[PDB]
Design a binder for this molecule. Sequence first.
Ligand SMILES: Nc1ncnc2c1ncn2[C@H]1C[C@H](O)[C@@H](COP(=O)(O)OP(=O)(O)OP(=O)(O)O)O1
Ligand SMILES: Nc1ncnc2c1ncn2[C@H]1C[C@H](O)[C@@H](COP(=O)(O)OP(=O)(O)OP(=O)(O)O)O1
Ligand SMILES: Nc1nc2c(ncn2[C@H]2C[C@H](O)[C@@H](COP(=O)(O)O)O2)c(=O)[nH]1
Ligand SMILES: Nc1nc2c(ncn2[C@H]2C[C@H](O)[C@@H](COP(=O)(O)O)O2)c(=O)[nH]1
Ligand SMILES: [Mg+2]
Ligand SMILES: [Mg+2]
Lengths: 464, 464
Amino acid sequence: TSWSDRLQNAADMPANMDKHALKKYRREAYHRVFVNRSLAMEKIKCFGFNMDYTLAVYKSPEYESLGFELTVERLVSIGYPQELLSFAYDSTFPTRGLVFDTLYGNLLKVDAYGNLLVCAHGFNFIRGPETREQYPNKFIQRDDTERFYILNTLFNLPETYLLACLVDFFTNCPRYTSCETGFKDGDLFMSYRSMFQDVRDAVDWVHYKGSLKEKTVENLEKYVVKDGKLPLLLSRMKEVGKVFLATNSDYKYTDKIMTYLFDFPHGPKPGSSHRPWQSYFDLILVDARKPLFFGEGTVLRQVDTKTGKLKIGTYTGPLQHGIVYSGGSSDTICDLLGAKGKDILYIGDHIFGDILKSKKRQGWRTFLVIPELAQELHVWTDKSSLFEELQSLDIQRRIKKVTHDMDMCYGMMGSLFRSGSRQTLFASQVMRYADLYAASFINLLYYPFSYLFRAAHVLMPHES
Amino acid sequence: TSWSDRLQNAADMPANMDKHALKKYRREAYHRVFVNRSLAMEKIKCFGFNMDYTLAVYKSPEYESLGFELTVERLVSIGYPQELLSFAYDSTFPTRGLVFDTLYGNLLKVDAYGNLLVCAHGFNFIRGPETREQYPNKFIQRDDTERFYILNTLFNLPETYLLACLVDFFTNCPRYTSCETGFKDGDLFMSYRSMFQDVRDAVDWVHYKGSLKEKTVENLEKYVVKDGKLPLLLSRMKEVGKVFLATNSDYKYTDKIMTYLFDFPHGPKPGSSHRPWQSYFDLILVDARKPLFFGEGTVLRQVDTKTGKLKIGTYTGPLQHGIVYSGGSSDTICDLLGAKGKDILYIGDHIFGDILKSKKRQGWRTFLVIPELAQELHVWTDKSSLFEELQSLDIQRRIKKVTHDMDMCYGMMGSLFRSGSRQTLFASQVMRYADLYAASFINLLYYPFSYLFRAAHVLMPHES
Ligand SMILES: Nc1ncnc2c1ncn2[C@H]1C[C@H](O)[C@@H](COP(=O)(O)OP(=O)(O)OP(=O)(O)O)O1
Ligand SMILES: Nc1ncnc2c1ncn2[C@H]1C[C@H](O)[C@@H](COP(=O)(O)OP(=O)(O)OP(=O)(O)O)O1
Ligand SMILES: Nc1nc2c(ncn2[C@H]2C[C@H](O)[C@@H](COP(=O)(O)O)O2)c(=O)[nH]1
Ligand SMILES: Nc1nc2c(ncn2[C@H]2C[C@H](O)[C@@H](COP(=O)(O)O)O2)c(=O)[nH]1
Ligand SMILES: [Mg+2]
Ligand SMILES: [Mg+2]
């Protein structure tokens, strides 16, 4: 049962808001908010939200699998072979945060220094001495952005698997010859770089001009987690501060999804009149273009919410009731809400585009949603004896074995957070940039108005 | 008594190499090697060294003070006012790692997120509410390299102080009007940006075309720490692996300094024949141009060691005995010594240019020398009751007060590593990029051939 089954199981539960019951619920790791740096919640004046995979968590593996099908169909329609149509999305293969190496066609799991934790070519896991042929220092240059692509988001799960499927398919299909950097089909050379670009192009097309949005919206219950407790949290937040939405999505899609997310026969709590999703927000901003949004951004536009089209021209007016913005920058939000960065708590799922960039560019407080944490915690817990076993030994053939059995419990590409005793890049970046994090933003409901999340002070080795 | 007095006090001590005496010596914090990430010393095949402030540690405050005088003299000679001649270097003012803000003329001490720990305008320490005028979020954008300059190295101590002196001088001199971004002298506007550039230009000139090198070399005992134990360490290292020198300096200067560093009436140990500094190294490389050296570098050249001039053309030959190289890249060292990055331990003092760049670009193992650690440890120790006091309270007017008295013990710009319970950027970068660090590279002498430096494994908050 997937991480989104855990999420929907907690979603079906009404909030018991008794102060005693709240403190007890957040005992459980799954309902907890984790703290990388202290944050006094009473200093927070604006709560900002992302929509996709934050407010609207798409069900797994159904959504990934829809994405994978439409990308495949798109590749087959631009000329890829019909055999692609036999692929079927497999949730047990990809882990998030993998690096595609476009030179050699390998998916890599790396730590924060670019050290190789896992290397797969197709579905062939390259170990020890064999990786040293292509990675003589067992290390990649992360600044080489033209060669290495980091697959950060849950939207990238379908392509993570599809890249391995393609490399597996071309390797084992006798119509093609394998070379170091790609495949020969007679007088045609298909490099892993141009293959990767085709997949990326196809994924982009499916979101932009394909039928992914259409398919999702015509079966929202199949694809999107809905939670009665969402309006309750938002309404509570609106009593102590301001609430905003900043999404990379367009207004028409945002309105279909948000509408559905609020579609209960009540408002914040049972018995109360239902109210439009828009009333829960002081500022709604679509077509954000994060991370560019946290730099110069783009021109501020105003949505005509009646036609779903943009009005012509740059919006020069004040924040008015019922106005929906498009584009702009993070300075728009600050100026319009009278916030400085440390007043803002921004709640997002995109480690780079939401969390890293708002923290480093603007000094916003950050809350990272990690949907898979629901499952990762259940595995971390019922395999703690294995990690604790791995911990003891470090004072060797045994270390390699335990490490592998540990990781396998998570899937073929192992845990999101570590490979044995080595932390991944993703884990590193969570700790550095996410002040808070949790399986779901909803976990904030279980903490009182002005709670002080504490992390311990950090000492250097000479200071200890 | 300065950090370089501590260093020269340990330098005057002969090595007692009895295995028992070595383990006892490295008990003491000052003779210890500190560990950020585990490193098995038996896996290290090449030890690489930087020269300036690594092998050749310049005496404090005499060297900074020579640097400050010649920079001042240079500014006065290009047209700055004669009053500059009354400045006198003051070691109690600058701390290393400060950020000059060229827009407002402030020296800032920041954490890794760009949060302001300390702000000084001239010698006026701007506190609390007053900094919020110019830094409304009490935060700087570190990616704004055109505005913010990080003063990383001990070479930058003179200009750190000189920048504050100039801002103090122009503020209080009635011939000038102070504006937000600089000084008005009638029809002349001198911005803090162009003033900063003049200082930087002057410092560059003093190293490149001025008399700093000449002055240093004609009084080496006054300016440079010499240690009988240096040839002993190098010779021990040469028995288990290869040794290299990579310096940004030119050959003529490197030869004067290195010669002096080896000038003892013995070789590695008393009684042994003295041998030239060059025999201690498998590869000598000058005019390195770090950090560009850790990317594409420059053309590999060969020094004519007889004339101290470069031979004309690119060196295409093998590593031969007695050859001295100039320029090249870090790949030169690897190819010529048959190393991969994790085989190399590079020992440097430049957090960015030596340590951060070799780690992230090449995956070298790193050892950061921090000369001031000698003093910082003595203050950390005999003021541990103050920090421990500061630690307790965190469950407020008191916190501000303790923090200030704590920092004052270090100097006006406080500790290199923290301001109260907040770590600086420099501390952050040491922990992230320096696998090992110590007050001096010599501390390695106190650890056996194949020692395993251990750091504890890191857990995420959900993993604990
Ligand atoms: N998770 C990510 N997804 C996409 N791009 C990223 C991610 N993290 C960093 N980048 C960008 C930032 C840099 O422009 C580029 C080069 O990597 P690098 O210089 O190693 O980044 P970095 O500065 O964040 O490293 P570090 O984690 O040590 O601070 O990749
Ligand atoms: N100590 C330093 N001295 C000089 N330049 C530096 C130093 N540290 C980082 N830089 C450079 C690297 C970047 O090009 C530039 C912009 O800063 P920023 O993007 O915040 O760097 P960073 O990626 O190292 O941040 P972080 O420490 O969070 O990883 O400054
Ligand atoms: N074009 C394109 N759109 C993407 C890609 N990945 C996700 N999206 C779209 C899906 C959503 O409409 C939007 C999500 O952004 P946000 O999480 O800010 O609400 O981004 C991609 O790889 N290419
Ligand atoms: N031009 C110039 N040279 C500098 C500056 N700071 C230090 N140097 C020179 C002094 C030494 O000759 C050389 C030191 O580099 P290394 O520590 O790699 O051996 O750099 C500077 O700011 N400008
Ligand atoms: Mg999102
Ligand atoms: Mg140096």
